């Protein structure tokens, strides 16, 4: 039992991974799984970032 946030007590812990090309990912679960639906195919390039502005 945990303090309520956004009118909810149970909580979902979110995790991520970076699958390398030519590799396989295996999910096993008998319960408590929020499965992936959409993944992202990252294309990388220098000259980017995240900034905070108004």
């Amino acid at each position: 039992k945990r303090p309520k946030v956004r009118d909810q007590e149970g909580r979902i812990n979110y995790y991520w991974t970076l699958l390398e090309p030519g590799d396989t990912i295996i999910f096993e679960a008998n319960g408590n799984l929020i499965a992936p639906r959409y993944a992202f195919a990252l294309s990388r390039g220098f000259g980017s970032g995240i900034i905070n502005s108004n």
Partner: protein, 169 residues
């Protein structure tokens, strides 16, 4: 540093607009200001080279800034800050001091030129003219626009006027 600018030449000339350094002549044909093209051109080349050569040594920043750390990575965050702020400090120094020093040098440079120009005219006129000291020479012989232009051009004919100047001196 050389005693020309603000030294034995008190102030500048507002009427001269075509160059940094120049001449102010006054003969029976009138008065006028002219600008020494060669000296001012050399000064322009030098100052342009100085400014640009300084500027190209600091390549423009191409990356970004910004990192995030959680409560258990404080030792990380301080380190990041200790780098970022630190680098800024160095660059601030490397900028400010630079300009300071360079500024002084530039002024001295200009001073030298004026002095050099003055000396050149001395070496041209020798005893044909009298040093007033305010920055000029009173000729001991009559000089028209032709001989004045020779003085500015560096082609002064000392032997031609030597006999006339000797008598008046």
């Amino acid at each position: 540093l050389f005693g020309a600018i603000a030294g034995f030449i008190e102030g500048g000339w507002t009427g001269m607009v075509d160059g940094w350094y120049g001449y102010h002549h006054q003969n029976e044909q009138g008065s006028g200001y002219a600008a020494d093209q060669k000296s001012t051109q050399n000064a322009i080349n030098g100052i342009t080279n100085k400014v640009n050569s300084v500027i190209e040594k600091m390549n423009t920043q191409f990356t970004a800034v910004g990192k995030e750390f959680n409560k258990l990575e404080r030792r990380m965050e301080n380190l990041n800050k200790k780098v970022d702020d630190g680098f800024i400090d160095i660059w601030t120094y490397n900028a400010e001091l630079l300009v300071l020093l360079e500024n002084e040098r530039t002024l001295d440079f200009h001073d030298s030129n004026v002095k050099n120009l003055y000396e050149k005219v001395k070496s041209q006129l020798k005893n044909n003219a009298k040093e007033i000291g305010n920055g000029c020479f009173e000729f001991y012989h009559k000089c028209n626009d032709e001989c004045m232009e020779s003085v500015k051009n560096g082609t002064y004919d000392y032997p031609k006027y030597s006999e006339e100047s000797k008598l008046n001196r």
